[PDB]
Amino acid sequence: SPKAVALYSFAGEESGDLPFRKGDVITILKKSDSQNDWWTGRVNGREGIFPANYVELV
């Protein structure tokens, strides 16, 4: 499974969003062919979707 580092924090205020802080390493559960889409991941015991541009694939 791909991992990615958060370049910026995401508050993830909407239901289904995955919040994270800058520097967190997110486990990617689903990605698309664009890093401008919302991808699916998990970190900190939460699961959800987030803007893929906020992360850098390891």
Applying CB under 5 A, which residues contact Cl ion? Answer: 10-11, 34-35, 46-47
Task: Give the shortest CB-28-to-Cl ion separation in angstroms.
Answer: 14
Question: How many residues would you count in the chain?
Answer: 58
Task: Give the shortest CB-57-to-Cl ion separation in angstroms.
Answer: 11
For residues 20 and 51, is the Cβ–Cβ distance under 8 A?
Answer: no
Q: How far is CA 36 from CA 17, 39, 45, 51, in A?
A: 15, 9, 24, 7
Residue 3 vs 47, nearer CB to Cl ion: 47
Residue 47 vs 56, nearer CB to Cl ion: 47
